[PDB]
Amino acid sequence: PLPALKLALEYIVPCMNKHGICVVDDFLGKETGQQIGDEVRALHDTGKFTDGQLVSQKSDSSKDIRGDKITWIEGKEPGCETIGLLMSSMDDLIRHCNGKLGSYKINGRTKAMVACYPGNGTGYVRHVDNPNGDGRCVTCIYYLNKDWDAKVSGGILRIFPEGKAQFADIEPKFDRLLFFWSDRRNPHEVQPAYATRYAITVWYFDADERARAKVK
Ligand SMILES: O=C(O)CNC(=O)c1nc(Cl)c2ccccc2c1O
Ligand SMILES: O=C(O)CNC(=O)c1nc(Cl)c2ccccc2c1O
Ligand SMILES: [Fe+2]
């Protein structure tokens, strides 16, 4: 459903409230997805990303292993127009969920974090996005890896939902949109990536949790 409204009301709200996780495929379409892919790859090739999260040292600094590289995008930067549009689509979508996602009242968003795992076997250890109540209630991730083959490239996002035995494996599939509670209900990890892996994350703020963040 293109109008975010039907998708938000008939799928996203119900899914988030029952599962705390929601997967939406073919969110923007091939044409738009590829345009974002192209903008993200230009950022990388023009050196706009960091050098990567320091994974290992071992006192010889050229034997230092670095992982995910990142860059923060506000949405208006020249050359990042399609990303700004993606961001606007996530926003319109969240706006349609107002008063429906838990008992939260979203009133803000972080800038978009574009992450690129180099594909050198690095990943992201199990973690909780917001474990100390910093205001972030919902994590939103947009994937842009065409023909991703987890069986050969790894890089699967594994979420250990609620506090129930199983976990949920989600492939960083092209044009896929993902939503999940940012707090302790969703510990998760990015398994080792053996191929270049791109994703765009945005975190939405709950009005109350954020307002008291400096005093909690
Ligand atoms: O930029 C601002 O208005 C103040 N920033 C924040 O409130 C803020 N808080 C958090 Cl927890 C994050 C967390 C990640 C990235 C950006 C953040 C951010 O801008
Ligand atoms: O990309 C994915 O499928 C899942 N990614 C994450 O869970 C993730 N989380 C955090 Cl908090 C960061 C934080 C910084 C850079 C990358 C991150 C990341 O990829
Ligand atoms: Fe995360």
Curated annotation (Swiss-Prot):
Monomer. Interacts with ING4; the interaction inhibits the hydroxylation of HIF alpha proteins. Interacts with PTGES3 (via PXLE motif); thereby recruiting EGLN1 to the HSP90 pathway to facilitate HIF alpha proteins hydroxylation. Interacts with LIMD1. Found in a complex composed of LIMD1, VHL, EGLN1/PHD2, ELOB and CUL2. Interacts with EPAS1. Interacts with CBFA2T3. Interacts with HIF1A. This is Egl nine homolog 1. According to PubMed:11056053, widely expressed with highest levels in skeletal muscle and heart, moderate levels in pancreas, brain (dopaminergic neurons of adult and fetal substantia nigra) and kidney, and lower levels in lung and liver. According to PubMed:12351678 widely expressed with highest levels in brain, kidney and adrenal gland. Expressed in cardiac myocytes, aortic endothelial cells and coronary artery smooth muscle. According to PubMed:12788921; expressed in adult and fetal heart, brain, liver, lung, skeletal muscle and kidney. Also expressed in placenta. GO terms for molecular function: 2-oxoglutarate-dependent dioxygenase activity; enzyme binding; enzyme inhibitor activity; ferrous iron binding; hypoxia-inducible factor-proline dioxygenase activity; L-ascorbic acid binding; peptidyl-proline 4-dioxygenase activity; peptidyl-proline dioxygenase activity. It comes from Homo sapiens (Human). The modification S-nitrosocysteine is found at residues 15, 22, 116, 137, 140. The chain holds residues 187 to 402 of 426 of the full protein. It is linked to Erythrocytosis, familial, 3: An autosomal dominant disorder characterized by elevated serum hemoglobin and hematocrit, and normal serum erythropoietin levels. Cellular oxygen sensor that catalyzes, under normoxic conditions, the post-translational formation of 4-hydroxyproline in hypoxia-inducible factor (HIF) alpha proteins. Hydroxylates a specific proline found in each of the oxygen-dependent degradation (ODD) domains (N-terminal, NODD, and C-terminal, CODD) of HIF1A. Also hydroxylates HIF2A. Has a preference for the CODD site for both HIF1A and HIF1B. Hydroxylated HIFs are then targeted for proteasomal degradation via the von Hippel-Lindau ubiquitination complex.
